Design a protein around this ligand. Sequence first.
Ligand SMILES: OC[C@H]1O[C@H](O)[C@H](O)[C@@H](O)[C@@H]1O
Ligand SMILES: OC[C@H]1O[C@H](O)[C@H](O)[C@@H](O)[C@@H]1O
Ligand SMILES: OC[C@H]1O[C@H](O)[C@H](O)[C@@H](O)[C@@H]1O
Ligand SMILES: [Zn+2]
Ligand SMILES: [Zn+2]
Lengths: 285, 285
Amino acid sequence: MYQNMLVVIDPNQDDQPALRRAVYLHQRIGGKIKAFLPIYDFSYEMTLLSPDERTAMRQGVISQRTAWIREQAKYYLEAGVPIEIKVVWHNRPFEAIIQEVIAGSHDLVLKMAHQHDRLEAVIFTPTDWHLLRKCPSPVWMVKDQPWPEGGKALVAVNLAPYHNALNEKLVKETLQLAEQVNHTEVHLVGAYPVTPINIAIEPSVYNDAIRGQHLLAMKALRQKFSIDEKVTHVEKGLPEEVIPDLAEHLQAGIVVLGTVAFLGNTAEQVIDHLRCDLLVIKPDE
Amino acid sequence: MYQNMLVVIDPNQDDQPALRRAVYLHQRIGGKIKAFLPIYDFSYEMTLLSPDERTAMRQGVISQRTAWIREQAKYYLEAGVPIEIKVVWHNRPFEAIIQEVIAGSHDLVLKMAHQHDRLEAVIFTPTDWHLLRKCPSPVWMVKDQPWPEGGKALVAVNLAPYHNALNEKLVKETLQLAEQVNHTEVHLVGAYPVTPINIAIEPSVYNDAIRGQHLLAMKALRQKFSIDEKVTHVEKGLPEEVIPDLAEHLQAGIVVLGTVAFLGNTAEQVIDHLRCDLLVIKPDE
Ligand SMILES: OC[C@H]1O[C@H](O)[C@H](O)[C@@H](O)[C@@H]1O
Ligand SMILES: OC[C@H]1O[C@H](O)[C@H](O)[C@@H](O)[C@@H]1O
Ligand SMILES: OC[C@H]1O[C@H](O)[C@H](O)[C@@H](O)[C@@H]1O
Ligand SMILES: [Zn+2]
Ligand SMILES: [Zn+2]
């Protein structure tokens, strides 16, 4: 399922929700965990310091963070969770992270994103954005607030040629995971656009007809996988509207998106409006 | 100076601060203005509509927006400001925009960014980010709040090999513009990092010494251009700290940044914290 998870350690605080998520997963689906932290002190480049001194600072930071990470993780290690700690020196974390993924062939990246308030959107940093856009493996952004009780997984699917295969991957992988992880109920959503009242003046047959195709496309899919109709949703509106309203209404613990350095308009507009975890999945091909 | 400006029309509202900025500029530095608006209605792809109907909708939206833009801009046209209106059909605005730039060899892109409240950061959309990262020409993000009275231009410069040339371009271009535009006073800032109290335990000689180099580097530069020392700043801290504190303290109307799809850490971290216009300049080479 995901046997090789990379958790990106957040240097700015002791608690590591991304690691906590990784352990939660491990104990249910197996798989190894690399707890990975790239750091730097720019003062590492400022003929102002000795060569020896540059080294002692660089080596001293590696050792200290490693022990700190091990302190955070002690219970998980003593519990016998297979966690490898890698702190590395690198000035560009997202590049560091993506090179680690490729080197260690990681099949999942987990990284914390902060939500300051329950009313608001999860804050995605620039690093987060570079990951989401560019990281080859799937990327799971782990909101630092509690998982809603009985929270659902919501998968956005595209309903309007080979987009068929991408949709299939997305639903396949989400289902195999939700089923080995506490049987989280999985829902599907497709939003269809209704023509702005503005564009109109250039026919509400449009409405029923488009609603028609999408329902057909949803069913075909639902059924390639024996999904219940009741967990499948076909909605009028902008994706960035529909998906987070439906997330709130469903108490979705996570939203799962598949991609088109650019995720496609749906994903770009949506991601900035999420109030729960995000999982981004790119076509492996 | 900038003889070929592209203003990205914001479809979501009537008032166009980016165009208003473009006119403001024109009447002081000359140059032509293309008022550019890419649009689409996804319903344009949904065998659900006639070929004729797809066209009538597509052609009808082009014509209507064109007249709307002309309505917004009437006073500027009647005033005799040289404004070409281009509305085009394209599903990816940032791609549309960047292709227009290359096609029309635009030397400046202006586009509005919204600040919801004076206390907060200007909201950069995903499109804004793609532009800032990828658009070949300079990109001027025009905050939709008033320009501070006597507002200054603040230029971030790098102070720690060929970074010399990039710095030079940045200061040259900002100065030639501020001087033909109302003589906006230009300031320079370089921030130097102080080693976290945390990294320490692995010498406040560091402090004075690093402060030293940067002052030397600042002066060399200031003086390649006969800049007053009093408008030049060398500060301890994170760039994302120093630059917006100094912006607030200075009443800087705009912050000018030069780049390293990635602007370099300084620019990435800073941009998300700005409370004023932004101008991004990439090495032409
Ligand atoms: O949204 C404001 C954010 O800005 C700062 O980085 C704060 O330290 C963080 O707690 C907060 O959520
Ligand atoms: O979508 C592009 C994103 O790039 C940046 O990293 C910003 O953190 C965010 O405001 C923006 O939305
Ligand atoms: O920050 C919240 C923003 O969200 C919405 O897009 C609002 O319409 C805009 O007025 C506001 O500034
Ligand atoms: Zn917070
Ligand atoms: Zn607002």
